[PDB]
RNA sequence: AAACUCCAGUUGACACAAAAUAGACUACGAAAGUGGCUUUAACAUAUCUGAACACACAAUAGCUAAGACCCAAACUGGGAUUAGAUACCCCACUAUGCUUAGCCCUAAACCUCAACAGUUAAAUCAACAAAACUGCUCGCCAGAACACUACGAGCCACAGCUUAAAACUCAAA
C-alpha cells in the first residue's frame, strides 16, 4: 500500500520537483534546499505523483494532509475500486475417488462465486494407465455441476511434457450470464 | 537461606497437596552447566553514524569528512586490539569465578552421595 | 609446504642489520641471538634488497598476472609508470610557473595516492541473526581495504567498455583520474559507501 | 492516577550522565520484579500455566541456591596439592 | 553535598536549580515506547504542548517504525521543535518497553536537550483487564 | 494486508470488570475450591469404619429468565499464508466469562497412591515412580477389543447424565 503521509526529512532522490502549499509550481531543486524550505515555513513534504520522471513532491501542513487523506477514503467508500483476481490452483489425479472429487468440486464452486480464477491440473494416477481423452472428461464433469456459473478461461491443454492436462475456469461475465438466461428462457418457451 | 522443602512434595505422610512438582529429582548433580557463549555489543557504532552523517551532507566526499573518518578508523583499531586482548585475559586467566571445567574437577572430588555405602 | 614448521621467513632489510648494538633494547637483543639458532627459508625470487623495491607495486603486478606470465605483467606495469610520467611531464611543460608547483611528476607518488583514494572505509558483511543473513555495515581491516582498491582498479581496466585500448594507456588514464578523486573506480567506492549507509539500521547486528 | 507525580520510579541524572541514570532505573525496575511482570502481562497466562511456571521457578531457586552453597563450601579446597607425588 | 538520586519533593526547600527554575517548573518529555511505534510529546510544567513527534510523523512505515533508529529520529525531531520554544532542560517520563525506549532519549539529547531525571510510568495493573490470548508460534 | 482516522499524545473527571508486590510464605476448607480492604455470622463429632442410587455438596463448559458490559472471546465476517487452509498469524464482533433466581451434575474432579491404627526389624525391594511393611474395614478388579456403546431403569437432564451387557473377532493386548 502507498499511504498519503509526510515523507519526512530524508528524501529518496537528489533532484526534486517541488510545489507550493497553495499549488504554485516551484520547479526542480535539490533535496538540501527542500529541507531548508520545510524548516523555514514549518511544513511537511508529501509525494503527489511518482510516475513522472522528475519526482513530484508538495509541501503541506498537517491539516492539509488530513483533509486529503480524508478525501481519498471517501472516494473509495463511494466508488470502491475492484481488486486483482486471485488465482486458485488444484492438482487432481486421474483415479481420484468420487467422494474426493465431489469435495473439490464444491470447493471450485465457492471460488467461482468469489470471482476467482481456478487453475485445474490433472495428472496421471499412480500405477494407472490413462488416456488424455479420459483425463479431459473430468474437466467436463466438474464444469457440468456449474451449468451457467462457470466457463473455460483456458481450455484443456497438455502440459508438463504431455503427462498432465491443465485448464483455467472463470465466472461467466454479466453479458454471458444474461445470454445463458436468454437461451434458457427460449428453450422454456419452446417446451 | 535456601527455601524449605519440608512438606513441599507429594509423599506418604504429607497430608497437604503438593507445593512443588519438580520434573527432575531435587538432587544436586556432580557437575555445573557450561557457560553460554555471549553476544557482545557493537563498538564504534557511534563514530560510524557520525561518519555516515557527514557523507550525507557532503555528497560522500571523503575530503570533507577526514576528521570523522579518522575518528571512526582510530576507534576501529583500538576496538581491534582490545578484542585481541580480551581473549588472552578473560579466556585463559579465568578472572573472578572459576570456569565450568575447573569447577567440575572440584566437584569430582566431592561427589553428591544420594545412596548408602 | 616443503618447509617444516621450524623454518622462519627471511628478513630482507639492510638497515635492520647495520643498526648498532648500543641502540638495541634487551628485547631486540634477544630476538637477534634467537635467530642465530633458527632455520630460515630461502628468499623468494620476487623481493630483493634493492632501493627501488616497492611492495605495493609488486603486489599490484601479481594481481594483473595471467597464467603465471610475470614477464608480461611486469612489462605492463613499467609501461604504465612510464605512461603516467610522460603525461605529467607534458602537463608540466604546458603549465605556467604557478601551476607547475602543484603538478606531480613522480609516478610512484601518483600510484600510491590513487590507490589510497579508492580504498573503502566500510563494507557489507553477511551476519546471521534469527536464521537469516543481513548485509551489515562493518569496518574493514587494512588488508581488505587495500585489496579492494587494487581489485577494483584492475577489474575496471579489463572491462570490455575499453575498445582496442592497450592496458598501459588504460591504467595510466585511470590512475591519474583516481589521483584527482574522479573516474569509475572512485564511483565504485562511493556506491559501497552509499549502500552501507542505506543499511545503517542493521549496524547493531555486529558484536565486535 | 491519584498519586503525586515524579516520585515513583524516578531517578535523577548526575553530571549529565544519562546512561548511568537509565541503567540505575532499569536495575530498580528489575530487582522489584516490574520488568518481568510487564512482559508476562502482554498475553494472558492461564492459571494452570502460571502455577506450573511458579513451581518451575521455585524448584530452580532451591536447586541453584543449594549448588551455590556447595560451591562456596568446597572453594577452599581448590588450593594446590599438598602431597604432590603421593 | 552528596548527590541524591531521589527527586526533590515539591513544597520542601531544595537548592537544586536549572537555569533558575525549580524541578517542578522544568518541562516534561513524555515518551510512549510501544511495540510497533514510538511517540514523543514535550509539554510545559503547566501542561502546555510544546512539540510532538513519532516514528510515523517522520516518514517511517510498517516494521521500520518499531526500530531504535526510528525512535532516535523522532527524538531529534521533537527536540528541534521544542528547542525553538525555549526548552533546554527536560524531565523524561517514558512508558512501555518498546524498542524505542532508550533510543528516543538519545535523540532528545542529540537534539540539544538536557535530561535532568528519568521516570518510568509503564502501566502495570494491580490485578485490571484480561489481556489477549497467547500466540501459537 | 485488512481495519480505524469524531484517530493519537498530555491533563482532568470517571466501574454490576479484575484483584501487582507480600508469596523464597505453605495456610484454610469435606472435596470442588480459597491469596485487595472492613465488619457481622462462622468452620460437625471425646472410638474407628460405614453408600454410583439415601442426604447434602461438587471446577470449567452449558441451559432458562432478568440485568450489567471495561476487557477477553467459541461462532461468524474480513486480511494474509498455502497445492488446498473450513487451521496455525492479523483485525472486528457475538454467545460466553459478571450479578440475580433456578437448573445441569461432568473433569487427567489425578498428589492416577481409600479411611483408621501401628512399625523401621526381619527377606529392603520385579522395573519405574514418591523406601518397605503390619492390623482392620469399606469400595473396586479378573485377556484384548466391541464399549464413556446397545437395551432396560432413574433423572427439572430431550444431540444429556448415571448405571451398563452381548454377538461377531483376535492370540494377543
Ligand atoms: K490485588
Ligand atoms: K470421574
Ligand atoms: K494429576
Ligand atoms: Mg515428569
Ligand atoms: Mg506472585
Ligand atoms: Mg463415618
Ligand atoms: Mg454399593
Ligand atoms: Mg458419579
Ligand atoms: Mg457445577
Ligand atoms: Mg453461567
Ligand atoms: Mg474487544
Ligand atoms: Mg458480550
Ligand atoms: Mg466482580
Ligand atoms: Mg484439581
Ligand atoms: Mg472410605
Ligand atoms: Mg475385558
Ligand atoms: Mg464422559
Ligand atoms: Mg450413554
Ligand atoms: Mg437409553
List the determination method. Answer: cryo-EM
Return the bridge partners of A45, or none. A59
Distance between CA atoms of residues C41 and A37, nearest Å: 69
Chain E: residue nearest A47 by CA? E59
Q: How far is CA E100 from the centre of its chain?
A: 10
CA dihedral sign, ordered E65, E106, E118, B40:
positive
Q: Enter the C-alpha cell of residue B26.
A: 531435587
* Cβ proximity of E109 and E90 under 8 Å: no
Distance between CA atoms of residues E60 and E47, nearest Å: 28
Ligand 13 center from residue E22 Cα (angstroms): 45
Query: What does residue C132 show for φ and ψ, rounded to 5 degrees?
Result: -130, 150
Residues of A in contact with E74 (CB under 8 A): none
Cα atoms in the Cβ-side hemisphere of radius 13 Å centred on D6: 19
Distance, angstroms, CA B17 to C1' F55? 28
* Cβ proximity of A164 and A121 under 8 Å: yes
Ligand 3 center from residue E107 Cα (angstroms): 54
Cα atoms in the Cβ-side hemisphere of radius 13 Å centred on C201: 16
* Cβ proximity of D9 and D32 under 8 Å: no
Would you tell me the crossing angle of helices C184-198 and C167-179 to the nearest 10 degrees? Answer: 50
Return the bridge partners of A92, or none. A122
Decide: residue D81, CB within 10 A, 0-12 exposed, 13-18 middle, 19+ buried: exposed
Decide: helix, strand or coil at residue A117. strand
Contacts of C126 (CB under 8 A, 6+ apart): C133, C134, C135, C136
Distance, angstroms, CA A103 to C1' F151? 38
Give one DSSP letter per residue of A1-48, joined into a string: ----S---SS-S-SEEEEE-TTS-EEEEEEHHHHHHHHHHHT-EEEEE
For residue A20, the tally of other CB atoms under 10 A from its CB is: 14
Residue A41 region, left (φ>0) first, then alpha (ψ -120 to 50), else beta?
Answer: alpha
Distance, angstroms, CA B77 to C1' F56? 83
Distance between CA atoms of residues B25 and B11, nearest Å: 13
Ligand 9 center from residue A87 Cα (angstroms): 51
D near C: at least 3 beta-carbon pairs less than 8 Å apart: no
Return the bridge partners of E90, or none. E115
Residue whose CA lies closest to nucleotide F71 C1': E129
Distance between CA atoms of residues B55 and C190, nearest Å: 10
- Kind and range of the H or E run holding E47: none
* Cβ proximity of E90 and E26 under 8 Å: yes
Distance between CA atoms of residues B55 and B67, nearest Å: 12
Cα atoms in the Cβ-side hemisphere of radius 13 Å centred on B49: 14
Chain C touched by B76 (CB under 8 Å):
yes
| Interface probe with B: pick from D66, D77, D81, D82, most Cβ of B within 10 Å | D66
Contacts of E32 (CB under 8 A, 6+ apart): E38, E39, E40, E94, E95, E96
Distance, angstroms, CA E129 to C1' F67? 22
Resolution of the experimental structure, in angstroms: 2.4
Decide: residue A153, CB within 10 A, 0-12 exposed, 13-18 middle, 19+ buried: middle
Biggest distance spanned by C-alpha atoms of chain C = 64
Decide: residue B45, CB within 10 A, 0-12 exposed, 13-18 middle, 19+ buried: middle
Cα atoms in the Cβ-side hemisphere of radius 13 Å centred on C66: 5
CA dihedral sign, ordered E14, E15, E16, E18:
positive
Residues of B in contact with C141 (CB under 8 A): 80
Residues of E in contact with A7 (CB under 8 A): 59
Closest Cβ–Cβ partner in B45, B76, B79 for C204: B45
Distance between CA atoms of residues D79 and D86, nearest Å: 16
CA angle A65, A68, A74 (to 5 degrees): 140
Q: Which of B117, B39, B42, B101 is nearest to B76 (CA)?
A: B42
Distance between CA atoms of residues A174 and A172, nearest Å: 7
Query: What does residue E114 show for φ and ψ, rounded to 5 degrees?
Result: -110, 120
Distance between CA atoms of residues B83 and B60, nearest Å: 30
* Cβ proximity of B34 and B100 under 8 Å: yes
Query: What does residue A141 show for φ and ψ, rounded to 5 degrees?
Result: -60, -45
Distance between CA atoms of residues C19 and C17, nearest Å: 5
* Cβ proximity of D56 and B26 under 8 Å: no
Q: Which of E91, E31, E13 is nearest to D10 (CA)?
A: E91
Distance, angstroms, CA E126 to C1' F136? 54
Residues in chain D: 86
- Kind and range of the H or E run holding C111: helix C107-116
Chain E touched by C24 (CB under 8 Å):
no
Closest Cβ–Cβ partner in D10, D39, D42 for E117: D10
- Kind and range of the H or E run holding B45: helix B45-57
- Nearest nt (C1') to B1 (CA)? F24
Cα distance from D21 to chain E (closest Cα, Å)? 7
E near D: at least 3 beta-carbon pairs less than 8 Å apart: yes
Q: How far is CA D72 from the centre of its chain?
A: 20
Residues of E in contact with C200 (CB under 8 A): 69
- HEC readout, A144-189: HCCCCCEEEEEEEEEECCCCEEEEEEEECCHHHHHHHHHHHHHHHH
Cα distance from B110 to chain D (closest Cα, Å)? 8
A near E: at least 3 beta-carbon pairs less than 8 Å apart: yes
User: CA dist B65 to C35, C37, C176, C203, Å?
Assistant: 45, 50, 22, 20
From edge to edge, which strands make up the β-sheet containing A150-159? Answer: A87-93, A117-123, A164-171, A150-159
Amino acid at each position: 500500500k502507498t499511504a498519503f503521509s509526510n515523507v519526512g526529512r530524508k528524501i529518496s532522490q537528489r533532484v526534486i520537483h517541488l510545489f507550493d502549499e497553495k499549488g504554485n509550481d516551484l520547479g526542480n531543486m535539490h533535496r538540501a534546499n527542500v529541507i531548508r524550505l520545510m524548516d523555514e515555513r514549518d511544513l511537511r513534504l508529501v509525494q503527489r505523483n511518482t510516475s513522472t520522471e522528475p519526482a513530484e513532491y508538495q509541501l503541506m501542513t498537517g491539516l492539509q494532509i488530513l483533509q486529503e487523506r480524508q478525501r481519498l477514503r471517501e472516494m473509495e467508500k463511494a466508488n470502491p475500486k475492484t481488486g486483482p483476481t486471485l488465482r486458485k490452483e488444484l492438482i487432481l489425479s486421474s483415479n481420484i475417488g468420487q467422494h474426493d472429487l465431489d469435495t473439490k468440486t464444491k470447493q471450485i464452486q465457492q471460488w467461482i462465486k468469489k470471482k476467482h480464477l481456478v487453475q485445474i491440473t490433472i495428472k496421471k494416477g499412480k500405477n494407472v494407465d490413462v488416456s488424455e481423452n479420459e483425463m479431459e472428461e473430468i474437466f467436463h464433469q466438474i464444469l457440468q455441476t456449474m451449468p451457467g456459473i462457470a466457463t473455460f478461461s483456458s481450455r484443456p491443454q497438455a502440459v508438463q511434457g504431455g503427462k498432465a492436462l491443465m485448464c483455467v475456469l472463470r465466472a461467466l461475465s454479466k453479458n454471458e450470464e444474461k445470454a445463458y438466461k436468454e437461451t434458457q428462457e427460449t428453450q422454456e418457451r419452446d417446451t | 537461606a535456601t527455601p524449605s522443602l519440608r512438606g513441599r512434595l507429594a509423599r506418604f505422610g504429607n497430608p497437604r497437596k503438593p507445593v512443588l512438582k519438580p520434573n527432575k529429582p531435587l538432587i544436586l548433580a556432580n557437575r555445573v552447566g557450561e557457560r553460554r557463549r555471549e553476544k557482545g555489543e557493537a563498538t564504534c557504532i557511534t563514530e560510524m553514524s557520525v561518519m555516515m552523517a557527514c557523507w550525507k551532507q557532503n555528497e560522500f566526499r571523503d575530503d570533507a569528512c577526514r576528521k570523522e573518518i579518522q575518528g571512526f578508523l582510530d576507534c576501529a583499531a583500538r576496538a581491534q586490539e582490545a578484542r585481541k586482548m580480551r581473549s588472552i585475559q578473560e579466556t585463559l586467566g579465568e578472572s573472578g569465578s572459576l570456569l565450568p571445567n575447573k569447577l567440575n574437577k572440584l566437584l569430582q572430588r566431592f561427589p553428591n552421595k544420594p545412596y548408602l555405602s | 609446504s616443503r618447509y617444516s614448521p621450524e623454518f622462519k621467513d627471511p628478513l630482507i632489510d639492510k638497515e635492520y642489520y647495520r643498526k648498532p648494538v648500543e641502540e638495541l633494547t634487551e628485547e631486540e637483543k634477544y630476538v637477534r641471538e634467537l635467530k642465530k639458532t633458527q632455520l630460515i627459508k630461502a628468499a623468494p625470487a620476487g623481493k630483493t634488497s634493492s632501493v627501488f623495491e616497492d611492495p605495493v607495486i609488486s603486489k599490484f603486478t601479481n594481481m594483473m598476472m595471467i597464467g603465471g606470465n610475470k614477464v608480461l605483467a611486469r612489462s605492463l606495469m613499467i609501461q604504465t609508470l612510464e605512461a603516467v610520467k610522460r603525461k605529467q611531464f607534458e602537463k608540466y611543460h604546458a603549465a605556467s610557473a604557478e601551476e607547475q608547483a602543484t603538478i606531480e611528476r613522480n609516478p610512484y607518488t601518483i600510484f600510491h595516492q590513487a590507490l589510497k583514494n579508492c580504498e573503502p572505509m566500510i563494507g557489507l558483511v553477511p551476519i546471521l541473526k534469527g536464521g537469516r543473513f543481513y548485509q551489515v555495515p562493518v569496518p574493514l581491516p587494512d588488508r581488505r581495504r587495500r585489496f579492494l582498491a587494487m581489485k577494483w582498479m584492475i577489474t575496471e581496466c579489463r572491462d570490455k567498455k575499453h575498445q582496442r585500448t592497450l592496458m598501459p594507456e588504460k591504467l595510466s588514464h585511470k590512475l591519474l583520474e583516481a589521483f584527482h578523486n574522479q573516474g569509475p573506480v572512485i564511483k565504485r567506492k562511493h556506491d559501497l559507501h552509499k549502500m552501507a549507509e542505506a543499511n545503517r539500521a542493521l549496524a547493531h547486528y555486529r558484536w565486535w | 492516577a491519584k498519586h503525586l507525580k515524579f516520585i515513583a520510579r524516578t531517578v535523577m541524572v548526575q553530571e549529565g550522565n544519562v546512561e548511568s541514570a537509565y541503567r540505575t532505573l532499569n536495575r530498580i525496575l528489575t530487582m522489584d520484579g516490574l520488568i518481568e511482570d510487564i512482559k508476562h502481562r502482554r498475553y494472558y497466562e492461564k492459571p494452570c500455566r502460571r502455577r506450573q511456571r511458579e513451581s518451575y521457578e521455585r524448584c530452580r531457586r532451591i536447586y541453584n541456591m543449594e549448588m551455590a552453597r556447595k560451591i562456596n563450601f568446597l572453594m577452599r579446597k581448590n588450593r594446590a596439592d599438598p602431597w604432590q607425588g603421593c | 553535598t552528596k548527590f541524591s538520586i531521589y527527586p526533590p519533593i515539591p513544597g520542601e526547600e531544595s537548592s537544586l536549580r536549572w537555569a533558575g527554575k525549580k524541578f517542578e517548573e522544568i518541562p516534561i518529555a513524555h515518551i510512549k515506547a510501544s511495540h510497533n511505534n514510538t511517540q514523543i510529546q514535550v509539554v510545559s510544567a503547566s501542561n502546555e504542548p510544546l512539540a510532538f513527534a513519532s516514528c510515523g510523523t517522520e516518514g517511517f512505515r510498517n516494521a521500520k517504525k518499531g526500530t531504535g533508529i526510528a525512535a532516535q529520529t523522532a527524538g531529534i525531531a521533537a527536540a528541534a521543535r521544542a528547542k525553538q520554544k525555549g526548552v533546554i532542560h527536560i524531565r523524561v517520563v517514558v512508558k512501555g518497553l518498546g524498542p524505542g525506549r532508550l533510543s528516543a532519549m538519545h535523540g532528545l539529547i542529540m537534539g540539544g536537550l538536557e535530561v535532568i531525571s528519568i521516570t518510568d510510568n509503564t502501566p502495570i495493573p494491580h490485578x485490571g483487564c484480561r489481556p489477549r490470548k497467547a500466540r501459537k508460534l
